[PDB]
Design a protein around this ligand. Structure first.
Ligand code: CL
Ligand code: CL
Ligand code: CL
Lengths: 142, 142
């Protein structure tokens, strides 16, 4: 089987991958922000929206991923398990889940429709040769 | 925060934990049932249910778990192997993923409410002496 966590929301993995990695904030900064704003909504008994329903599972899934990454990097007596877990987290799943947190939090702050257009706008800007774009890349607001 | 993934769906971690860990099918079977019933709906871009939105996310991050497992057995010496990491996973979050997959799939097949009422009745039924219960077990259907 094969699923795109973004398809049901009107985006894809490729649309987010077209953003540069350094653009997304850290896993901890996103987690902090997700609490401060939607602490109350996330811990509620009402699916506030499919964005809330996705954000709860994603956040909990990542903690499962992080428990495993901890066990593998600490309790394997092979020393290369450190570098393998650091690589796995940076290279692979940390950035994949940094995008996912950012998408659903921004859809909740600026609305799904606003956020999507910002992707496509960012998409032309990056694809555009530098002397032909504005020095500042696009920016998200209401 | 502290997010119960069952709370927006009327249940709690303790209610799923109220059934014996023997009871929930392997993660592999549940994926097969999930792909055999809601493949096209889960891959659909249509939000089909808050259960759908949540099932999609659980499916993908079981894969992120097994992907890490693979790295360890591939990139490290064979005493630390994929079989070791996976044995760790299934000991840990393995049941947690079986309960989730079951709850959300079985909530799609039968009514959600059917499932919740089953959880309590089946849970007490297996705990009751044969002499002091009805002979026929609480069951799920429509
Ligand atoms: Cl971080
Ligand atoms: Cl392109
Ligand atoms: Cl008991």
């Amino acid at each position: 089987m094969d699923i795109d966590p973004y398809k049901e929301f009107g985006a894809t993995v490729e649309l987010l991958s077209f953003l540069p990695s350094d653009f997304f904030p850290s896993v901890r900064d996103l987690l902090d922000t997700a609490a401060a704003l939607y602490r109350d909504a996330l811990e509620s008994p009402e699916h506030c929206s499919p964005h809330h329903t996705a954000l709860r599972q994603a956040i909990l899934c990542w903690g499962d991923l992080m428990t495993l990454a901890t066990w593998v990097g600490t309790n394997l007596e092979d020393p290369a398990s450190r570098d393998l877990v650091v690589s796995y987290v940076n290279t692979n799943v940390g950035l994949k889940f940094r995008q996912l947190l950012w998408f659903h939090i921004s859809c909740l702050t600026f609305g799904r429709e606003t956020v999507l257009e910002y992707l496509v706008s960012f998409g032309v800007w990056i694809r555009t040769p530098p002397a032909a774009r504005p020095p500042n890349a696009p920016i998200l607001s209401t």
